């Protein structure tokens, strides 16, 4: 009855170590609209994270883009943590660049 979020984690530009970029967490297909989204660096919360204004699709499910400036480093691991009423515990989606 409640719709769980689809999650995609990706960079705005092709990821190159040492080169400033944006890390994106795109959540979509969810309902209701209350949702918690954090971006993580080696498991720790990044605090300068912005998001788009709440909007929704033809089927009324919501979508949001969360993003932060970042520099990939071949060592640090980045991830998106999503919590929503449909989830029995927060979901962690690791960023995969090579994709």
């Amino acid at each position: 009855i409640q719709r769980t979020p689809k999650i995609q984690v990706y960079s705005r530009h092709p990821a190159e170590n040492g080169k400033s970029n944006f890390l994106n967490c795109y959540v979509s297909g969810f309902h209701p609209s209350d949702i918690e989204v954090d971006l993580l660096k080696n498991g720790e919360r990044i605090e300068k994270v912005e998001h788009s204004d709440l909007s929704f699709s033809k089927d009324w499910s919501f979508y949001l883009l969360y993003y932060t400036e970042f520099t990939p480093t071949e060592k640090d691991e980045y991830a998106c943590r999503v919590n929503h009423v449909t989830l029995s515990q927060p979901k962690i989606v690791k960023w995969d660049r090579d994709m």
Binding site: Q8, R12, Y26, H31, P32, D53, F56, L65, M99
Partner: protein
């Protein structure tokens, strides 16, 4: 080609304390250009694209007053629908509204839209003739009877055929350097071995506008759907969009597979091949 203006409203009641949260966003095609957030400081409609900022203070005052009044209507409506559905006032509920207009390549009215939801399900919708309503259930049927007696459809129609198309045209001209340019997809393919005998080919489309796009895989010139995967088109955050499609292939046979990219900014479809 064709163009669209759309507004999306979300109202969420907050039974623990205070007024419902109201968020409104406005788009031309896939470009956001305004927003209102009842939780924000301005308490004003705010620009979200450079080409709307040239509008004068009378524009922002009017838009602020209309959207605030609509937000209060949503407040009343959340209470009304709670009663229709015999719901307790302990729970949080959501009303969503989408409306707007399309113009064709000639800049003339093509189609109008007005659709409303409650808790994520259809509630009432204006039909394509802009003269009749579809109510999904008996609660919406009450609303429909009220809206017919109030001639609500006629008021909606006047806006959708009038100010909606007139200001859409204005925005498209004021914003023409971005709103009326297409950014074709920048494409490439990646190769990922998954075994000594199989590999994934991933076909990438990046930096395109508008968001509509088609990625298809062919094997020896025939559409292939088996062993493929397609991600939802996603925003880059700089106003452009991204998508990819992938296929698993026998290693050594990559040359048989072609990725075909269709987009408004592409006179011809693009064909990519791992050579």
């Amino acid at each position: 080609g064709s163009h669209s203006m759309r507004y999306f409203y979300t109202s969420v009641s907050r039974p623990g304390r205070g007024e419902p949260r109201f968020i409104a966003v406005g788009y031309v095609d896939d470009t956001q250009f305004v927003r209102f957030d009842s939780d924000a400081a301005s308490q004003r409609m705010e620009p979200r694209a450079p080409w709307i900022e040239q509008e004068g203070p009378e524009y922002w005052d009017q838009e602020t007053r209309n959207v605030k009044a609509q937000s209060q209507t949503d407040r009343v409506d959340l209470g009304t629908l709670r009663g229709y559905y015999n719901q307790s006032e302990d729970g949080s509920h959501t009303i969503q509204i989408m409306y707007g207009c399309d113009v064709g390549p000639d800049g003339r009215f093509l189609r109008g839209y007005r659709q409303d939801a409650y808790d994520g399900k259809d509630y009432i919708a204006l039909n394509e003739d802009l003269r009749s309503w579809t109510a999904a259930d008996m609660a919406a049927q009450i609303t429909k009877r009220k809206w017919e007696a109030a001639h609500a459809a006629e008021q909606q129609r006047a806006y959708l055929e009038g100010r909606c198309v007139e200001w859409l045209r204005r925005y498209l001209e004021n914003g023409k350097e971005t709103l009326q340019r297409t950014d074709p997809p920048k494409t490439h393919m990646t190769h990922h071995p998954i075994s000594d005998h199989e590999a994934t080919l991933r076909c990438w489309a990046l930096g395109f506008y508008p968001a509509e796009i088609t990625l298809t895989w062919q094997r020896d010139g025939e559409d292939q759907t088996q062993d493929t995967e397609l991600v939802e088109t996603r925003p880059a955050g700089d106003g452009t969009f991204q998508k990819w499609a992938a296929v698993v292939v026998p290693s050594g046979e990559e040359q048989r597979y072609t990725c075909h990219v269709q987009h408004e900014g592409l006179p011809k479809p693009l064909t990519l091949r791992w050579e």
